[PDB]
Amino acid sequence: SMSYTWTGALITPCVYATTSRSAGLRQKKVTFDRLQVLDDHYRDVLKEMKAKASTVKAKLLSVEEACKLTPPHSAKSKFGYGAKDVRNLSSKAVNHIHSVWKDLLEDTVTPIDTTIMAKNEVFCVGRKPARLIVFPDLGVRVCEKMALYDVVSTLPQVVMGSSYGFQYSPGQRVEFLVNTWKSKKNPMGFSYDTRCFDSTVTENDIRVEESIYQCCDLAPEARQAIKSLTERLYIGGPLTNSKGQNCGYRRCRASGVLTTSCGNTLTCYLKASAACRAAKLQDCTMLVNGDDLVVICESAGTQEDAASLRVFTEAMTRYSAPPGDPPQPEYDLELITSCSSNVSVAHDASGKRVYYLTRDPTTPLARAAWETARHTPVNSWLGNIIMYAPTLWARMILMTHFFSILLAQEQLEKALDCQIYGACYSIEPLDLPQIIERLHGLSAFSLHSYSPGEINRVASCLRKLGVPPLRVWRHRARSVRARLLSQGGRAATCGKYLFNWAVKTKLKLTPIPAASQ
Numbered sequence: 001s002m003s004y005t006w007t008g009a010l011i012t013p014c015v016y017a018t019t020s021r022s023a024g025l026r027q028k029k030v031t032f033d034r035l036q037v038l039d040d041h042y043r044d045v046l047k048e049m050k051a052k053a054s055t056v057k058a059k060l061l062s063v064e065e066a067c068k069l070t071p072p073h074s075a076k077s078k079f080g081y082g083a084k085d086v087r088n089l090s091s092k093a094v095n096h097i098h099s100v101w102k103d104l105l106e107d108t109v110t111p112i113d114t115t116i117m118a119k120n121e122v123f124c125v126g127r128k129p130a131r132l133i134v135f136p137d138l139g140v141r142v143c144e145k146m147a148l149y150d151v152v153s154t155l156p157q158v159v160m161g162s163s164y165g166f167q168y169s170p171g172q173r174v175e176f177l178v179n180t181w182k183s184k185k186n187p188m189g190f191s192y193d194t195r196c197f198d199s200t201v202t203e204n205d206i207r208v209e210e211s212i213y214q215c216c217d218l219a220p221e222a223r224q225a226i227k228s229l230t231e232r233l234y235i236g237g238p239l240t241n242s243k244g245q246n247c248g249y250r251r252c253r254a255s256g257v258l259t260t261s262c263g264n265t266l267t268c269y270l271k272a273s274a275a276c277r278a279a280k281l282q283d284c285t286m287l288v289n290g291d292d293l294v295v296i297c298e299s300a301g302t303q304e305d306a307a308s309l310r311v312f313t314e315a316m317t318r319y320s321a322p323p324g325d326p327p328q329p330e331y332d333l334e335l336i337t338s339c340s341s342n343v344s345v346a347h348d349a350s351g352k353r354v355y356y357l358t359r360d361p362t363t364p365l366a367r368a369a370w371e372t373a374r375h376t377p378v379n380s381w382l383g384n385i386i387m388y389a390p391t392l393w394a395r396m397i398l399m400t401h402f403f404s405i406l407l408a409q410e411q412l413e414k415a416l417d418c419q420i421y422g423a424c425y426s427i428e429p430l431d432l433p434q435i436i437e438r439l440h441g442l443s444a445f446s447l448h449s450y451s452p453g454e455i456n457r458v459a460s461c462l463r464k465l466g467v468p469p470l471r472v473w474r475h476r477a478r479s480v481r482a483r484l485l486s487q488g489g490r491a492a493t494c495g496k497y498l499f500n501w502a503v504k505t506k507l508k509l510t511p512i513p514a515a516s517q
Ligand SMILES: CC(C)(NC(=O)c1ccc2c(C3CCCCC3)c3n(c2c1)CCOc1ccccc1-3)C(=O)O
Pocket: 015, 365, 366, 367, 368, 369, 370, 372, 397, 398, 401, 465, 466, 467, 468
Protein backbone atom coordinates (compact mmCIF):
# COMPACT_ATOMS: atom_id res chain seq x y z
CA SER A 1 0.00 0.00 0.00
CA MET A 2 1.03 3.64 -0.28
CA SER A 3 3.18 4.79 2.65
CA TYR A 4 1.36 8.11 2.48
CA THR A 5 -1.67 9.58 0.78
CA TRP A 6 -1.76 13.37 0.48
CA THR A 7 -4.73 15.74 0.23
CA GLY A 8 -2.77 18.72 -1.06
CA ALA A 9 -3.11 20.61 2.21
CA LEU A 10 0.28 22.17 2.77
CA ILE A 11 2.65 21.09 5.51
CA THR A 12 2.69 24.38 7.37
CA PRO A 13 5.57 25.92 9.38
CA CYS A 14 5.64 25.37 13.14
CA VAL A 15 25.74 26.05 6.34
CA TYR A 16 21.93 26.08 6.23
CA ALA A 17 18.85 24.94 8.11
CA THR A 18 15.99 22.80 6.80
CA THR A 19 12.50 24.34 6.73
CA SER A 20 8.93 23.63 5.65
CA ARG A 21 9.79 25.03 2.21
CA SER A 22 11.36 21.70 1.21
CA ALA A 23 8.58 19.52 2.67
CA GLY A 24 7.36 18.72 -0.83
CA LEU A 25 10.72 17.21 -1.78
CA ARG A 26 10.65 14.92 1.27
CA GLN A 27 7.03 13.85 0.73
CA LYS A 28 7.93 12.67 -2.77
CA LYS A 29 10.92 10.85 -1.32
CA VAL A 30 8.96 9.06 1.42
CA THR A 31 5.77 8.29 -0.53
CA PHE A 32 5.59 4.96 -2.35
CA ASP A 33 3.77 1.64 -2.54
CA ARG A 34 5.37 -1.07 -0.42
CA LEU A 35 5.44 -4.64 -1.64
CA GLN A 36 6.41 -7.29 0.86
CA VAL A 37 6.91 -11.00 0.36
CA LEU A 38 7.91 -13.15 3.31
CA ASP A 39 9.64 -16.55 3.33
CA ASP A 40 10.63 -19.24 5.83
CA HIS A 41 13.82 -17.39 6.83
CA TYR A 42 11.71 -14.50 8.04
CA ARG A 43 9.24 -16.86 9.71
CA ASP A 44 11.98 -18.90 11.34
CA VAL A 45 13.60 -15.78 12.81
CA LEU A 46 10.27 -14.27 13.94
CA LYS A 47 9.46 -17.51 15.78
CA GLU A 48 12.83 -17.48 17.54
CA MET A 49 12.20 -13.87 18.57
CA LYS A 50 8.71 -14.58 19.86
CA ALA A 51 10.16 -17.40 21.96
CA LYS A 52 12.53 -14.89 23.57
CA ALA A 53 9.78 -12.31 24.01
CA SER A 54 7.71 -14.94 25.83
CA THR A 55 10.21 -14.86 28.70
CA VAL A 56 9.82 -11.12 29.29
CA LYS A 57 7.55 -9.75 31.99
CA ALA A 58 6.67 -6.06 31.89
CA LYS A 59 4.51 -3.71 33.94
CA LEU A 60 2.14 -0.77 33.69
CA LEU A 61 3.54 2.57 34.74
CA SER A 62 1.11 4.67 36.78
CA VAL A 63 0.07 8.07 35.39
CA GLU A 64 2.51 9.71 37.82
CA GLU A 65 5.55 7.61 36.89
CA ALA A 66 4.89 8.35 33.22
CA CYS A 67 4.64 12.10 33.87
CA LYS A 68 7.92 12.07 35.81
CA LEU A 69 9.57 10.31 32.87
CA THR A 70 8.29 12.89 30.43
CA PRO A 71 11.13 14.98 28.96
CA PRO A 72 11.16 18.70 29.93
CA HIS A 73 11.00 20.19 26.42
CA SER A 74 8.18 18.21 24.79
CA ALA A 75 5.71 20.03 22.54
CA LYS A 76 2.87 21.25 24.76
CA SER A 77 -0.56 19.64 24.65
CA LYS A 78 -3.39 21.26 22.72
CA PHE A 79 -5.44 20.63 25.86
CA GLY A 80 -3.97 23.44 27.89
CA TYR A 81 -0.81 22.15 29.53
CA GLY A 82 2.80 21.53 28.61
CA ALA A 83 5.73 19.28 29.39
CA LYS A 84 6.72 21.14 32.57
CA ASP A 85 3.15 20.76 33.82
CA VAL A 86 3.39 17.03 33.21
CA ARG A 87 6.74 16.77 34.99
CA ASN A 88 5.25 18.71 37.92
CA LEU A 89 2.12 16.54 38.20
CA SER A 90 -0.20 19.50 37.79
CA SER A 91 -3.87 18.60 38.28
CA LYS A 92 -4.66 19.86 34.78
CA ALA A 93 -2.28 17.45 33.03
CA VAL A 94 -2.91 14.59 35.46
CA ASN A 95 -6.67 14.82 34.97
CA HIS A 96 -6.43 14.89 31.18
CA ILE A 97 -4.01 11.95 30.95
CA HIS A 98 -6.43 9.84 32.99
CA SER A 99 -9.19 10.73 30.53
CA VAL A 100 -6.92 9.88 27.59
CA TRP A 101 -5.98 6.51 29.13
CA LYS A 102 -9.58 5.57 29.82
CA ASP A 103 -10.47 6.39 26.23
CA LEU A 104 -7.65 4.18 24.97
CA LEU A 105 -9.12 1.23 26.87
CA GLU A 106 -12.73 1.91 25.88
CA ASP A 107 -12.08 2.83 22.23
CA THR A 108 -9.81 0.56 20.21
CA VAL A 109 -10.62 1.74 16.69
CA THR A 110 -10.96 5.50 16.23
CA PRO A 111 -7.78 6.81 14.57
CA ILE A 112 -5.84 9.10 16.91
CA ASP A 113 -4.74 12.50 15.62
CA THR A 114 -1.11 13.34 14.87
CA THR A 115 0.69 16.55 13.90
CA ILE A 116 3.16 16.61 11.01
CA MET A 117 5.95 19.18 10.86
CA ALA A 118 9.22 19.63 9.02
CA LYS A 119 12.32 19.66 11.23
CA ASN A 120 14.69 22.59 11.41
CA GLU A 121 18.15 21.00 11.34
CA VAL A 122 21.53 22.48 10.46
CA PHE A 123 23.66 20.96 7.70
CA CYS A 124 26.74 21.82 5.66
CA VAL A 125 26.66 21.81 1.85
CA GLY A 126 22.91 18.55 -3.02
CA ARG A 127 21.03 20.11 -0.11
CA LYS A 128 18.81 17.68 1.79
CA PRO A 129 15.06 18.31 2.25
CA ALA A 130 13.70 18.75 5.77
CA ARG A 131 12.78 15.63 7.71
CA LEU A 132 9.11 15.07 8.42
CA ILE A 133 8.13 14.27 12.00
CA VAL A 134 4.76 12.81 12.95
CA PHE A 135 3.63 12.84 16.59
CA PRO A 136 0.48 12.45 18.75
CA ASP A 137 -0.52 15.01 21.37
CA LEU A 138 1.36 15.17 24.70
CA GLY A 139 -1.44 13.41 26.57
CA VAL A 140 -1.23 10.41 24.26
CA ARG A 141 2.57 10.42 24.57
CA VAL A 142 2.37 10.01 28.35
CA CYS A 143 -0.15 7.16 27.98
CA GLU A 144 2.29 5.43 25.62
CA LYS A 145 4.79 5.33 28.47
CA MET A 146 2.16 3.94 30.83
CA ALA A 147 1.48 1.03 28.47
CA LEU A 148 4.89 0.45 26.94
CA TYR A 149 7.77 2.20 28.71
CA ASP A 150 8.71 -0.95 30.64
CA VAL A 151 8.52 -2.86 27.35
CA VAL A 152 10.41 -0.86 24.72
CA SER A 153 13.83 -1.13 26.38
CA THR A 154 13.82 -4.43 28.26
CA LEU A 155 12.24 -6.39 25.41
CA PRO A 156 14.63 -5.73 22.53
CA GLN A 157 17.62 -6.53 24.73
CA VAL A 158 16.20 -9.93 25.63
CA VAL A 159 15.19 -10.69 22.06
CA MET A 160 18.35 -9.57 20.32
CA GLY A 161 21.09 -10.00 22.91
CA SER A 162 24.45 -8.46 22.01
CA SER A 163 22.92 -7.22 18.73
CA TYR A 164 20.87 -4.56 20.53
CA GLY A 165 23.06 -1.49 20.18
CA PHE A 166 21.29 0.75 22.69
CA GLN A 167 22.51 -1.22 25.70
CA TYR A 168 26.11 -0.20 25.08
CA SER A 169 27.85 2.85 26.50
CA PRO A 170 30.21 4.44 23.96
CA GLY A 171 33.17 2.36 25.12
CA GLN A 172 31.10 -0.81 25.17
CA ARG A 173 30.08 -0.24 21.55
CA VAL A 174 33.73 0.14 20.57
CA GLU A 175 34.61 -2.95 22.56
CA PHE A 176 31.85 -4.98 20.92
CA LEU A 177 32.85 -3.92 17.40
CA VAL A 178 36.58 -4.50 17.90
CA ASN A 179 36.15 -7.86 19.61
CA THR A 180 33.64 -9.04 17.00
CA TRP A 181 36.03 -7.89 14.28
CA LYS A 182 39.05 -9.66 15.78
CA SER A 183 37.10 -12.91 16.20
CA LYS A 184 36.90 -13.56 12.47
CA LYS A 185 39.89 -15.10 10.69
CA ASN A 186 39.23 -12.81 7.72
CA PRO A 187 36.65 -10.21 8.82
CA MET A 188 34.26 -8.56 6.40
CA GLY A 189 31.77 -5.91 7.44
CA PHE A 190 29.19 -3.62 5.88
CA SER A 191 26.65 -1.06 7.05
CA TYR A 192 23.22 -1.23 5.42
CA ASP A 193 21.35 1.97 4.68
CA THR A 194 17.63 1.41 4.27
CA ARG A 195 16.09 4.05 2.04
CA CYS A 196 13.78 6.03 4.33
CA PHE A 197 13.35 3.13 6.74
CA ASP A 198 10.27 4.57 8.47
CA SER A 199 8.39 4.73 5.16
CA THR A 200 9.22 1.08 4.41
CA VAL A 201 7.57 -0.15 7.60
CA THR A 202 4.31 -1.84 6.59
CA GLU A 203 1.07 -2.46 8.47
CA ASN A 204 2.12 -6.10 8.67
CA ASP A 205 5.47 -5.06 10.20
CA ILE A 206 3.60 -3.14 12.87
CA ARG A 207 1.14 -5.92 13.67
CA VAL A 208 4.11 -8.26 13.91
CA GLU A 209 5.65 -5.89 16.46
CA GLU A 210 2.39 -5.89 18.44
CA SER A 211 2.28 -9.68 18.30
CA ILE A 212 5.75 -9.60 19.85
CA TYR A 213 4.75 -7.21 22.63
CA GLN A 214 1.84 -9.53 23.47
CA CYS A 215 4.23 -12.47 23.82
CA CYS A 216 5.34 -10.60 26.96
CA ASP A 217 3.67 -11.29 30.30
CA LEU A 218 1.66 -8.08 30.72
CA ALA A 219 -1.17 -6.68 32.84
CA PRO A 220 -4.61 -7.04 31.18
CA GLU A 221 -5.01 -3.28 30.93
CA ALA A 222 -1.59 -3.07 29.28
CA ARG A 223 -2.53 -5.59 26.59
CA GLN A 224 -5.66 -3.59 25.81
CA ALA A 225 -3.81 -0.27 25.56
CA ILE A 226 -1.00 -1.73 23.45
CA LYS A 227 -3.55 -3.23 21.06
CA SER A 228 -5.48 0.02 21.02
CA LEU A 229 -2.39 2.21 20.41
CA THR A 230 -1.40 -0.08 17.55
CA GLU A 231 -4.80 0.06 15.84
CA ARG A 232 -5.50 3.75 16.51
CA LEU A 233 -2.00 5.21 16.22
CA TYR A 234 0.91 2.97 15.24
CA ILE A 235 -0.30 1.24 12.07
CA GLY A 236 -1.34 4.54 10.55
CA GLY A 237 -3.78 7.42 10.75
CA PRO A 238 -4.67 11.00 9.67
CA LEU A 239 -2.00 13.74 9.47
CA THR A 240 -2.70 17.32 10.61
CA ASN A 241 -0.50 20.33 9.81
CA SER A 242 0.33 22.99 12.39
CA LYS A 243 -2.72 24.95 11.22
CA GLY A 244 -5.29 22.35 12.22
CA GLN A 245 -5.84 21.25 8.63
CA ASN A 246 -5.79 17.64 7.43
CA CYS A 247 -3.05 17.08 4.88
CA GLY A 248 -3.15 13.32 4.44
CA TYR A 249 -2.91 9.84 5.92
CA ARG A 250 -0.04 7.62 7.04
CA ARG A 251 0.34 3.87 6.60
CA CYS A 252 3.90 3.57 7.87
CA ARG A 253 5.97 4.26 10.96
CA ALA A 254 5.29 7.56 12.68
CA SER A 255 8.64 9.10 13.63
CA GLY A 256 7.59 10.50 17.00
CA VAL A 257 5.89 7.69 18.93
CA LEU A 258 7.40 5.85 21.89
CA THR A 259 7.75 2.61 19.91
CA THR A 260 9.58 4.11 16.91
CA SER A 261 12.99 3.13 18.23
CA CYS A 262 12.18 -0.28 19.73
CA GLY A 263 10.01 -1.13 16.72
CA ASN A 264 12.57 -0.14 14.08
CA THR A 265 15.19 -2.06 16.05
CA LEU A 266 13.09 -5.25 16.19
CA THR A 267 11.95 -5.03 12.59
CA CYS A 268 15.38 -4.18 11.22
CA TYR A 269 16.94 -7.04 13.20
CA LEU A 270 14.17 -9.41 12.04
CA LYS A 271 14.50 -8.56 8.34
CA ALA A 272 18.31 -8.41 8.38
CA SER A 273 18.66 -11.67 10.30
CA ALA A 274 16.60 -13.51 7.69
CA ALA A 275 18.48 -11.79 4.87
CA CYS A 276 21.78 -13.02 6.37
CA ARG A 277 20.39 -16.54 6.06
CA ALA A 278 19.17 -15.95 2.51
CA ALA A 279 22.66 -14.74 1.59
CA LYS A 280 24.43 -17.48 3.53
CA LEU A 281 26.71 -15.10 5.38
CA GLN A 282 29.11 -17.05 7.56
CA ASP A 283 29.59 -16.42 11.28
CA CYS A 284 27.38 -13.32 11.23
CA THR A 285 27.36 -10.80 14.06
CA MET A 286 24.84 -7.95 13.75
CA LEU A 287 24.66 -4.61 15.56
CA VAL A 288 21.34 -2.74 15.39
CA ASN A 289 20.17 0.65 16.58
CA GLY A 290 16.71 1.34 15.22
CA ASP A 291 17.05 1.53 11.46
CA ASP A 292 20.86 1.60 11.56
CA LEU A 293 22.45 -1.76 10.74
CA VAL A 294 25.99 -3.09 10.61
CA VAL A 295 27.00 -6.70 9.95
CA ILE A 296 30.43 -8.30 10.51
CA CYS A 297 30.99 -11.85 9.26
CA GLU A 298 33.65 -14.33 8.07
CA SER A 299 34.90 -13.51 4.55
CA ALA A 300 34.22 -16.05 1.80
CA GLY A 301 36.42 -14.24 -0.68
CA THR A 302 36.25 -10.93 -2.53
CA GLN A 303 33.78 -11.84 -5.28
CA GLU A 304 31.88 -14.23 -3.02
CA ASP A 305 31.34 -11.40 -0.51
CA ALA A 306 30.17 -9.08 -3.30
CA ALA A 307 27.68 -11.67 -4.52
CA SER A 308 26.63 -12.35 -0.92
CA LEU A 309 25.86 -8.70 -0.30
CA ARG A 310 23.81 -8.48 -3.49
CA VAL A 311 21.78 -11.49 -2.35
CA PHE A 312 21.55 -9.93 1.11
CA THR A 313 20.11 -6.79 -0.47
CA GLU A 314 17.66 -8.71 -2.65
CA ALA A 315 16.23 -10.39 0.47
CA MET A 316 15.92 -7.10 2.39
CA THR A 317 14.14 -5.66 -0.64
CA ARG A 318 11.66 -8.56 -0.78
CA TYR A 319 11.14 -7.96 2.94
CA SER A 320 10.38 -4.35 1.96
CA ALA A 321 13.64 -2.71 3.11
CA PRO A 322 15.36 -1.52 -0.15
CA PRO A 323 18.85 0.08 0.04
CA GLY A 324 19.54 3.78 -0.13
CA ASP A 325 23.26 3.43 -0.62
CA PRO A 326 23.91 0.01 -2.14
CA PRO A 327 25.86 -1.77 0.59
CA GLN A 328 29.61 -2.15 0.26
CA PRO A 329 31.90 -4.81 1.79
CA GLU A 330 34.78 -3.49 3.91
CA TYR A 331 37.95 -5.21 5.10
CA ASP A 332 39.09 -2.40 7.39
CA LEU A 333 37.04 -1.71 10.52
CA GLU A 334 37.94 1.97 10.45
CA LEU A 335 36.10 2.27 7.16
CA ILE A 336 32.80 1.00 8.55
CA THR A 337 30.40 3.73 9.63
CA SER A 338 27.49 2.75 11.86
CA CYS A 339 25.27 5.21 13.74
CA SER A 340 27.29 8.01 12.13
CA SER A 341 30.45 6.72 13.83
CA ASN A 342 33.48 4.56 13.10
CA VAL A 343 36.12 2.96 15.31
CA SER A 344 39.61 4.43 15.10
CA VAL A 345 42.91 3.82 16.89
CA ALA A 346 45.30 6.07 18.77
CA HIS A 347 47.86 5.61 21.53
CA ASP A 348 47.88 6.64 25.19
CA ALA A 349 50.63 7.98 27.45
CA SER A 350 52.63 4.74 27.34
CA GLY A 351 51.93 4.09 23.67
CA LYS A 352 49.21 1.51 24.23
CA ARG A 353 46.65 1.24 21.42
CA VAL A 354 43.29 2.76 22.30
CA TYR A 355 40.25 2.30 20.06
CA TYR A 356 37.61 5.03 20.26
CA LEU A 357 34.58 6.36 18.35
CA THR A 358 35.01 9.21 15.92
CA ARG A 359 33.17 10.55 12.86
CA ASP A 360 33.40 13.12 10.07
CA PRO A 361 33.52 16.50 11.89
CA THR A 362 31.61 18.36 9.17
CA THR A 363 28.16 18.44 10.72
CA PRO A 364 29.37 18.94 14.31
CA LEU A 365 31.59 21.84 13.23
CA ALA A 366 28.83 23.41 11.13
CA ARG A 367 26.26 23.17 13.91
CA ALA A 368 28.70 24.49 16.50
CA ALA A 369 29.50 27.36 14.13
CA TRP A 370 25.78 28.00 13.76
CA GLU A 371 25.32 27.99 17.54
CA THR A 372 28.17 30.43 18.11
CA ALA A 373 26.39 32.75 15.70
CA ARG A 374 22.68 32.77 16.52
CA HIS A 375 23.02 31.95 20.22
CA THR A 376 20.50 29.11 20.25
CA PRO A 377 18.97 27.38 23.31
CA VAL A 378 20.41 24.29 21.61
CA ASN A 379 24.01 23.42 22.54
CA SER A 380 24.99 20.57 20.20
CA TRP A 381 28.66 21.58 20.50
CA LEU A 382 28.77 20.55 24.15
CA GLY A 383 27.20 17.18 23.43
CA ASN A 384 29.74 16.52 20.67
CA ILE A 385 32.55 17.44 23.04
CA ILE A 386 31.24 14.82 25.46
CA MET A 387 30.40 12.08 22.94
CA TYR A 388 33.59 12.50 20.96
CA ALA A 389 35.83 13.71 23.79
CA PRO A 390 38.65 11.33 22.76
CA THR A 391 38.77 12.57 19.17
CA LEU A 392 41.37 14.77 17.51
CA TRP A 393 38.80 17.29 16.30
CA ALA A 394 36.79 17.61 19.52
CA ARG A 395 39.86 18.15 21.70
CA MET A 396 41.78 20.58 19.48
CA ILE A 397 38.92 22.53 17.94
CA LEU A 398 35.62 22.41 19.81
CA MET A 399 37.03 22.45 23.34
CA THR A 400 39.59 25.15 22.52
CA HIS A 401 37.11 27.42 20.76
CA PHE A 402 34.29 27.14 23.27
CA PHE A 403 36.33 27.42 26.44
CA SER A 404 37.81 30.42 24.66
CA ILE A 405 34.30 31.89 24.34
CA LEU A 406 33.35 30.83 27.87
CA LEU A 407 36.25 32.79 29.36
CA ALA A 408 35.62 35.96 27.36
CA GLN A 409 31.93 36.03 28.26
CA GLU A 410 32.79 34.73 31.73
CA GLN A 411 30.23 31.96 31.21
CA LEU A 412 32.44 29.25 32.72
CA GLU A 413 29.82 28.39 35.34
CA LYS A 414 26.56 28.85 33.45
CA ALA A 415 25.03 25.40 32.96
CA LEU A 416 23.86 24.50 29.47
CA ASP A 417 21.08 22.18 28.35
CA CYS A 418 22.51 19.25 26.43
CA GLN A 419 20.60 16.51 24.65
CA ILE A 420 22.74 13.38 24.42
CA TYR A 421 22.40 9.64 24.90
CA GLY A 422 18.63 9.97 24.73
CA ALA A 423 18.36 12.34 27.68
CA CYS A 424 18.56 16.07 28.33
CA TYR A 425 21.32 16.91 30.80
CA SER A 426 21.99 20.18 32.60
CA ILE A 427 25.76 20.33 32.07
CA GLU A 428 28.23 22.65 33.79
CA PRO A 429 31.40 23.06 31.67
CA LEU A 430 33.66 22.76 34.70
CA ASP A 431 32.31 19.23 35.16
CA LEU A 432 33.72 18.22 31.77
CA PRO A 433 36.91 16.66 33.12
CA GLN A 434 34.89 14.43 35.49
CA ILE A 435 32.32 13.61 32.83
CA ILE A 436 34.96 12.64 30.29
CA GLU A 437 36.92 10.52 32.75
CA ARG A 438 33.85 8.43 33.55
CA LEU A 439 32.62 8.05 29.95
CA HIS A 440 35.93 7.57 28.18
CA GLY A 441 38.56 7.04 30.86
CA LEU A 442 41.74 9.02 31.57
CA SER A 443 43.32 7.92 28.30
CA ALA A 444 41.02 10.42 26.60
CA PHE A 445 43.09 13.34 27.93
CA SER A 446 46.26 11.65 26.72
CA LEU A 447 45.58 10.14 23.29
CA HIS A 448 48.16 10.86 20.59
CA SER A 449 49.44 9.41 17.30
CA TYR A 450 46.02 9.35 15.64
CA SER A 451 45.58 7.30 12.47
CA PRO A 452 46.58 8.88 9.12
CA GLY A 453 43.07 8.41 7.77
CA GLU A 454 41.58 10.15 10.80
CA ILE A 455 44.04 13.04 10.61
CA ASN A 456 43.58 13.44 6.86
CA ARG A 457 39.80 13.51 7.25
CA VAL A 458 39.96 16.20 9.94
CA ALA A 459 42.53 18.44 8.26
CA SER A 460 40.79 18.11 4.90
CA CYS A 461 37.41 18.87 6.48
CA LEU A 462 38.73 22.07 8.05
CA ARG A 463 40.01 23.28 4.68
CA LYS A 464 36.63 22.61 3.09
CA LEU A 465 34.99 24.79 5.74
CA GLY A 466 37.40 27.70 6.02
CA VAL A 467 38.40 26.72 9.55
CA PRO A 468 41.98 27.44 10.63
CA PRO A 469 44.47 24.54 10.41
CA LEU A 470 45.15 22.39 13.47
CA ARG A 471 48.37 24.31 14.06
CA VAL A 472 46.38 27.48 14.71
CA TRP A 473 44.32 25.54 17.25
CA ARG A 474 47.31 24.18 19.16
CA HIS A 475 48.57 27.73 19.58
CA ARG A 476 45.19 29.08 20.67
CA ALA A 477 44.81 26.13 23.04
CA ARG A 478 48.02 26.91 24.93
CA SER A 479 46.59 30.39 25.53
CA VAL A 480 43.14 29.24 26.63
CA ARG A 481 44.90 26.71 28.84
CA ALA A 482 47.09 29.18 30.72
CA ARG A 483 44.05 31.40 31.31
CA LEU A 484 42.20 28.46 32.85
CA LEU A 485 45.16 27.44 35.01
CA SER A 486 45.71 30.98 36.26
CA GLN A 487 42.13 31.19 37.51
CA GLY A 488 42.77 28.05 39.53
CA GLY A 489 39.99 26.04 41.15
CA ARG A 490 37.79 24.05 38.79
CA ALA A 491 38.85 26.19 35.84
CA ALA A 492 42.43 25.09 36.51
CA THR A 493 41.38 21.44 36.46
CA CYS A 494 39.88 22.08 33.03
CA GLY A 495 43.16 23.55 31.83
CA LYS A 496 45.15 20.67 33.27
CA TYR A 497 43.11 17.76 31.89
CA LEU A 498 41.34 19.00 28.76
CA PHE A 499 44.44 20.72 27.36
CA ASN A 500 47.47 18.74 28.53
CA TRP A 501 47.79 17.79 24.85
CA ALA A 502 48.63 21.33 23.72
CA VAL A 503 51.60 21.51 26.06
CA LYS A 504 55.17 20.30 25.60
CA THR A 505 55.83 19.47 29.25
CA LYS A 506 52.95 17.27 30.36
CA LEU A 507 51.30 17.57 33.76
CA LYS A 508 50.47 14.29 35.49
CA LEU A 509 46.83 13.31 35.03
CA THR A 510 45.59 11.37 38.03
CA PRO A 511 42.08 10.05 38.88
CA ILE A 512 39.76 12.95 39.68
CA PRO A 513 38.01 12.56 43.08
CA ALA A 514 34.23 12.61 43.52
CA ALA A 515 32.80 15.74 45.14
CA SER A 516 33.37 16.18 48.87
CA GLN A 517 31.78 17.87 51.91
C1 LIG B 1 39.57 33.86 10.19
C2 LIG B 1 39.93 33.35 11.59
C3 LIG B 1 41.34 32.72 11.54
N1 LIG B 1 38.89 32.33 11.91
C4 LIG B 1 38.70 31.66 13.10
O1 LIG B 1 39.39 31.88 14.10
C5 LIG B 1 37.61 30.64 13.11
C6 LIG B 1 37.31 29.98 14.34
C7 LIG B 1 36.29 29.00 14.40
C8 LIG B 1 35.55 28.66 13.26
C9 LIG B 1 34.46 27.71 13.02
C10 LIG B 1 33.80 26.76 14.04
C11 LIG B 1 34.84 25.74 14.60
C12 LIG B 1 34.20 24.78 15.63
C13 LIG B 1 33.47 25.54 16.76
C14 LIG B 1 32.43 26.51 16.18
C15 LIG B 1 33.06 27.51 15.19
C16 LIG B 1 34.16 27.84 11.64
N2 LIG B 1 34.98 28.80 11.05
C17 LIG B 1 35.84 29.32 12.01
C18 LIG B 1 36.85 30.29 11.95
C19 LIG B 1 34.94 29.21 9.60
C20 LIG B 1 33.55 29.73 9.13
O2 LIG B 1 32.43 29.28 9.90
C21 LIG B 1 32.27 27.89 9.97
C22 LIG B 1 31.27 27.27 9.18
C23 LIG B 1 31.10 25.87 9.22
C24 LIG B 1 31.93 25.09 10.07
C25 LIG B 1 32.93 25.70 10.86
C26 LIG B 1 33.11 27.11 10.83
C27 LIG B 1 39.87 34.56 12.60
O3 LIG B 1 40.79 34.47 13.60
O4 LIG B 1 39.08 35.46 12.53
